[PDB]
Amino acid sequence: MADDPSAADRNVEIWKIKKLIKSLEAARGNGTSMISLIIPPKDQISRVAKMLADEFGTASNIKSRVNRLSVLGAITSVQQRLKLYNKVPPNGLVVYCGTIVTEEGKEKKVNIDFEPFKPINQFMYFCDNKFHTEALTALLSDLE
């Protein structure tokens, strides 16, 4: 009972974003590392892929291959995505890459990338062992 086929993307981000930040913050598992990058209109796709490129070479210094493979594997997975959207959208291109496993011993490959309904403040970095979502938990909190 939706409205339009293409417009669906609009109504989606609505309940998709709110549930996203609510899910990520809940995401838990062994010692892993997630990825959270955003390409706002006040920046260039080269900047995001640039600041990440450096974080990669330094991530290989990690003692625990687990995290290293989580930070590097995610950076490369997303890096290939940004190269697809050479253009910088206003809603900011968000990207999520990580792997969380529950007590059941089942891993979960985090793969998400799309343009939300709200604009992105600016270039934001992600933290290890925790999802980085300020503009998300903020906006959704303010508006609703």
Domain ranges of the chain: 1-144
Location of structure tokens 């933290």 = 127
* d(C-alpha 113, C-alpha 96), whole Å: 6
Chain centre distance of CA 29: 17
**Rounded distance between C-alpha atoms, residue 36 and residue 71, angstroms:** 11
Give the list of residues 6+ apart from residue 21 with CB closer than 8 angstroms, or none: 133, 136, 137, 140
Please return the burial class of 40, using the count of CB atoms within 10 Å of its CB with bins 0-12, 13-18 and 19+: buried
- What was the elucidation method? NMR
Bridge partners, residue 35, by sequence: 97
Cα 95–Cα 111–Cα 33 angle in degrees, nearest 5:
80
CA nearest 113: which of 81, 88, 86?
Answer: 81
Max Cα-Cα span within the chain: 52
DSSP-derived 3-state class of residue 108: strand
Distance of CA 73 to the CA centre of its chain: 14
Whether the Cβ atoms of residue 140 and residue 114 lie closer than 8 Å to each other: no
Looking at residue 105, the DSSP 8-state letter turns out to be S
Residue partners of 76: CB distance under 8 A and separation at least 6: 56
Is residue 110 within 8 A of residue 3, CB to CB? The reply is no
Backbone CA torsion sign across 80, 116, 128, 54: positive
CATH class label, 1-144: alpha beta
* Residue 112 φ/ψ, nearest 5 degrees: -145, 140
In one letter, which amino acid is 39?
I
